[PDB]
Write a protein that binds this ligand. Structure first.
Ligand SMILES: *[C@@H]1O[C@H](CO)[C@@H](O[C@@H]2O[C@H](CO)[C@@H](O[C@@H]3O[C@H](CO)[C@@H](O)[C@H](O)[C@@H]3O)[C@H](O)[C@H]2NC(C)=O)[C@H](O)[C@H]1NC(C)=O
Ligand SMILES: *[C@@H]1O[C@H](CO)[C@@H](O)[C@H](O)[C@H]1NC(C)=O
Ligand SMILES: C[C@@H]1O[C@H](O)[C@@H](O)[C@H](O)[C@@H]1O
Length: 276
């Protein structure tokens, strides 16, 4: 049926027209690629014959629902990819048993909020990619206080329009060493003052949004910052509004990735010098 890539270790089962998890596979399998298969639903213990799973790819499997305890057995799974599944229902315990999950990829899974996302138990989670979804709020649920290992959070291409100070409230009780935050390609046109106060970010992606200006000293408390994207935004370079950001981008050209340009001229924000 599938295609053995690594004996008793890795197999390729995509494009085979499967509706159920294959059984004619070594119970030692570590990596399984079940992508592009009409699984439709995932009941409890859907992966029982795979106690040795570390990587599971379920991308585009027409999955509509994941019941409670779907991966209950997979206790050694570190990477789970669910990209492209039209999830119309996610059980409270859908991710029960995943006590070693480090990477959860849920791009394009009709995710509308992070509140009803049963991941508050995956304390080992390091990377959460929920890009290309319907998330409208950047309000990080309280359960994010237990994900003390998260270093990558990709919320790009969603429906976030603002960034309030309360949004990152949770990130003050952990801590979180090197957290790379992507919020690019969002209908974002507003950021609230000090929204990143007492916050420690290594990378910040805010490019290709709807930003015309940002609060003064918005990036004051941020010495852990190594990279930042702000390019492709309708920056208003009228002074003294663009004063703070022009000075900052110029005095931090190394960090900045790409180039934030003025709207109506194309001039780099870092080049603008506001008169006192
Ligand atoms: C892939 O997994 C298979 C099992 O599904 C491995 O083959 C099996 O290897 C064991 C050895 O650990 C064999 O069991 C017994 O081994 C002793 C050696 O002391 C021997 O005296 C017995 O006669 C018996 O062979 C078992 O028969 C064998 N089964 C198969 C599939 O033929 C295999 O080693 C794994 N692939 C690798 C990493 O080589
Ligand atoms: C935090 O996450 C842990 C994971 O073991 C869970 O038991 C707990 O309910 C969550 N909230 C609390 C009480 O800290
Ligand atoms: C663990 C592997 O699969 C099972 C048995 O065939 C052998 O123990 C083999 O080494």
């Amino acid at each position: 049926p599938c295609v053995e890539v690594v004996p008793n270790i890795t197999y390729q089962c995509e494009e085979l027209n499967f509706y159920k998890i294959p059984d004619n596979l070594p119970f030692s399998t570590k990596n399984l690629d079940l992508s592009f298969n009409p699984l439709r639903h995932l009941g409890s213990y859907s992966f029982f014959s795979f106690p040795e799973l570390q990587v599971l790819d379920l991308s585009r499997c027409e999955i509509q629902t994941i019941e409670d305890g779907a991966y209950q057995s997979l206790s050694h799974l570190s990477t789970l990819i669910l990209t492209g599944n039209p999830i119309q229902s996610l059980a409270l315990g859908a991710f029960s048993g995943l006590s070693s999950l480090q990477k959860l990829v849920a791009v394009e899974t009709n995710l509308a909020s992070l509140e009803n996302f049963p991941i508050g138990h995956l304390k080992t989670l390091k990377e959460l990619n929920v890009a290309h979804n319907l998330i409208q709020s950047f309000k990080l649920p309280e359960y994010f206080s237990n994900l003390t290992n998260l270093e990558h959070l990709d919320l790009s291409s969603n429906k976030i329009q603002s960034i309030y100070c309360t949004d990152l409230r949770v990130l003050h009780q952990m801590p979180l060493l090197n957290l790379s935050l992507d919020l690019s390609l969002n209908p974002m046109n507003f950021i609230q003052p000090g929204a990143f106060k007492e916050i420690r970010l290594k990378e910040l992606a805010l490019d290709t949004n709807q930003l015309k200006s940002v609060p003064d000293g918005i990036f004051d408390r941020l010495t852990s910052l190594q990279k930042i994207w702000l390019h492709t935004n309708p920056w208003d370079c009228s002074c003294p509004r663009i004063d703070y950001l022009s000075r900052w981008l110029n005095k931090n050209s190394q960090k900045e990735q790409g180039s934030a340009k003025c709207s109506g001229s194309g001039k780099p924000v870092r080049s603008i010098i506001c008169p006192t």
